[PDB]
From a paper:
The [name] domain in [name] mediates interactions with the intracellular sequences of the transmembrane proteins PlexinA4 and SynCAM 15,8. While the [name] domains in [name] and DAL-1 only share ~40% sequence identity, the residues in the binding groove of these two [name] domains are nearly identical as shown by the structural superimposition, strongly suggesting that the interaction between [name] and SynCAM 1 uses the same binding mode. We mutated Trp306 in human [name] to glutamate (W306E) to disrupt [name]-SynCAM 1 interactions. According to the [name]/SynCAM 1 binding mode discussed above, Trp306 (corresponding to Trp308 in zebrafish [name]) is important for interacting with the “GXY” motif in SynCAM 1. The corresponding site in the [name] domains of [name] and FARP2 contains a negatively charged residue (Asp97, Glu100 and Asp107 in zfFARP1, mFARP2 and zfFARP2, respectively), suggesting that it cannot serve as a phosphatidylinositol binding site in these [name] domains. Overall, the surface of these [name] domains show highly polarized surface electrostatic potential, with one side positively charged while the opposite side negatively charged. According to the binding mode between the [name] [name] and SynCAM 1 proposed above, the side of the [name] domain proximal to the membrane displays positive electrostatic potential. The positively charged surface on the [name] domain likely interacts with the negatively charged lipid membrane surface, thereby facilitating the membrane localization of [name] and its interaction with SynCAM 1. In particular, the [name] domains of [name] and FARP2 contain a Lys-Arg-Lys-Arg (KRKR) motif in the loop connecting strands β5 to β6 in the F3 subdomain, which is highly conserved in [name]/2 from different species. A similar motif is also present in FRMD7 ([name] domain-containing protein 7), which has a [name] domain that is closely related to that in [name] and FARP2 (~60% sequence identity). The KRKR motif constitutes a major part of the positively charged surface, and may serve as a lipid binding site for targeting [name]/2 to the plasma membrane.
[name] ([name], RhoGEF and pleckstrin domain-containing protein 1) and its close homolog FARP2 were identified as guanine nucleotide exchange factors (GEFs) for RhoGTPases that play regulatory roles in neuronal development. [name] and FARP2 share a conserved domain architecture, containing a N-terminal 4.1, ezrin, radixin and moesin ([name]) domain, which is followed by a long linker (~200 residues) that connects to a Dbl-homology (DH) domain and two pleckstrin homology (PH) domains. We determined crystal structures of the [name] domains of zebrafish [name] (zfFARP1), mouse FARP2 (mFARP2) and zebrafish FARP2 (zfFARP2). As expected from their high degree of sequence identity (>60%), the structures of these [name] domains are very similar to one another, with root mean square deviations within 1.0 Å.
Numbering used by the authors: 38 to 282, 290 to 319
Write the structure that this text describes.
């Protein structure tokens, strides 16, 4: 039950080091990171890391820390959004919105968030507005060459300039709000994909949202199974099972027995968070 030190990385590319008991629940560490950030609406967030199997796993806030930690000297947890709500104007804390805008900033660069060209330009133009202020032909075009917010940004540079000339006078807090309003309508918003194959042997991807379970081909949404139309979620070894209310039980082959367990957990945790 001794104390250990854990290095947590924040959404602003900074890192801190906290000290928690080994036998303490994950919630204890999660509380320290929230109070360090003065995060009042921390319910939307979580701590994720890569395990020994090199797959990114959430930190169980109910289980002990030493159960899910291996070498706290080498592992870096990262504070990330865990649940993306549908309504965005209700996020009371301006800081809470700010961490979300940072989150979208990250997903935009990783490729976890893709969208239409004009949408992507507008989303960047708000990020630029929040960071360097009002438009300036000299400063802006320079700033887009020193900072790459989306892959293949150079081809999209002219459109970002146009949108930036419109955001004049908007504060960074006003820009984060515009980020969320424009990002929350995106097909890939808050979407973290789990690869799978149907009985047809078709390479697809499954995900979960506030509305329910999602099915993607590449990055295009295929089906949506709302919680109202989802009877039971199950998994056997390397096959996922979705029972509907009753059509049939759609089977999905996934990568490993752990992949099913991971997706199964976040499906229950998503429904339990919105119902």
């Amino acid at each position: 039950g001794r104390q250990i030190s854990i290095r947590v990385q924040m959404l602003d590319d900074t890192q801190e080091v906290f000290e928690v008991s080994q036998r303490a629940p994950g919630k204890a560490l999660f509380d320290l990171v929230c109070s360090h950030l003065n995060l009042v609406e921390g319910d939307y967030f979580g701590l994720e890391f890569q395990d020994q199997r090199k797959m990114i796993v959430w930190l169980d806030l109910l289980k002990p820390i030493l159960k899910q930690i291996r070498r706290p000297k080498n592992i870096i947890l990262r504070f990330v959004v865990k649940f993306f709500p549908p309504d965005h104007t209700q996020l009371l804390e301006e800081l809470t919105r700010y961490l979300f805008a940072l989150q979208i900033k990250h997903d935009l660069a990783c490729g976890r968030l893709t969208c239409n060209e004009s949408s992507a330009a507008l989303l960047v133009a708000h990020i630029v507005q929040s960071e360097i202020g009002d438009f300036d032909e000299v400063q802006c075009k320079q700033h887009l060459l020193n900072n790459k917010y989306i892959p293949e940004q150079d081809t999209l540079m002219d459109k970002i300039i146009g949108y930036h000339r419109k955001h004049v006078g908007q504060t960074p807090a006003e820009s984060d709000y515009q980020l969320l309003e424009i990002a929350r309508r995106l097909e890939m918003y808050g979407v973290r994909l789990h690869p799978a194959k149907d009985r047809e042997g078709t390479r697809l991807s499954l995900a979960v949202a506030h509305s329910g379970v999602l099915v993607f081909q590449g990055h295009t949404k295929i089906n949506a199974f709302n919680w109202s139309k989802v009877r039971k979620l199950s998994f056997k070894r390397k096959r996922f099972l979705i029972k509907l209310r009753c059509q049939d039980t759609l089977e999905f082959m996934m990568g490993s027995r752990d992949c099913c367990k991971v997706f199964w957990k976040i499906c229950v945790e998503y429904h339990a968070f919105f119902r």
